[PDB]
Amino acid sequence: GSNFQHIGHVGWDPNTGFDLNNLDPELKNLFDMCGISEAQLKDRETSKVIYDFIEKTGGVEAVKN
Amino acid sequence: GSHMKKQKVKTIFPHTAGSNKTLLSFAQGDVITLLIPEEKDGWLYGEHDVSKARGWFPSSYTKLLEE
Amino acid sequence: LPDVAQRLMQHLAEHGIQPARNMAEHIPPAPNWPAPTPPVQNEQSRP
């Protein structure tokens, strides 16, 4: 049907969290760098905040240039 | 990040919590790791080296593990 | 990668989020009575 523009690469949900099994080549790589763990990525109250950052300041095209 | 604290004590006598949900129970010859910088009202707070139970315990029933 | 972390930390501070490298427990109040003491006492003596 239809998809996002500035985002859509990230697999995250407000019920279960980031999708570790299929995470992006940058996503997990930052999480291991700033010090975040897979527990916070599965936290609907922490992963939400970490995702809201990428949706405004990450972006797969925005980080490219 | 952080882990187990350096300061520890050996309990030399038993202790019993009852209905408080904030106390630590043990026997004689057990070992506890201090989680706080100083005592309060003779109560000290720590984590047991055998069960990972936490709570306030009596300092007087214990002695340091220095030297 | 390396520049994205320098701007992440600024976002997480606005919600009080922290990375899992930077989390620990807390300490409870205390009981309603003083801490007990071992079997150590004096011995009664005549006047």
Return d(Cα A20, Cα A34) in angstroms, integer. 17
Number of domains, chain A:
1
Contacts of A29 (CB under 8 A, 6+ apart): C1
Domains, in order of start, for chain C: 1-47 (6.10.250.3330)
Return d(Cα B59, Cα B42) in angstroms, integer. 6
Return d(Cα B8, Cα B53) in angstroms, integer. 14
Q: Quick check: helix, strand or coil at residue A20? A: helix
On chain C, the residues whose CB falls within 8 A of the CB of A53 are 7-8, 11-12
Number of domains, chain B:
1
> Which among C40, C35, C39 has a CA at the least distance from the CA of B57?
C35
Structure tokens at B33: 């790791």
- Do the Cβ atoms of A56 and A7 come closer than 8 Å? no
**Structure determined by:** NMR
- Window A:31-60, CB contacts with C under 8 Å: 33-37, 39-40, 46, 49-50, 52-53, 57-58
- Do the Cβ atoms of B49 and B8 come closer than 8 Å? yes
Residue C25 at interface with chain B, using a CB cutoff of 8 Å: yes
Contacts of B17 (CB under 8 A, 6+ apart): B23, B24, B25, B55
| CB contacts < 8 A (B, C) | 50
- How far does the CA of residue C32 sit from the closest CA of chain A (Å)? 36
Structure tokens at B49: 């080296």
> Which among B45, B42, B40 has a CA at the least distance from the CA of B60?
B42
- Using CA atoms, how far residue C25 sits from A21, B3, B11, B14, B53, in Å, is 30, 11, 23, 26, 13
Beta strand ranges found along C1-47 (DSSP E)? none
User: What CATH number did the domain enclosing B36 receive?
Assistant: 2.30.30.40
Range of the domain at B14: 1-67
Return d(Cα A27, Cα B8) in angstroms, integer. 41
User: What CATH number did the domain enclosing A20 receive?
Assistant: 3.90.810.10
Range of the domain at A21: 1-65
Residues A46, C4: C-beta atoms closer than 8 Å: no
Return d(Cα A32, Cα A38) in angstroms, integer. 9
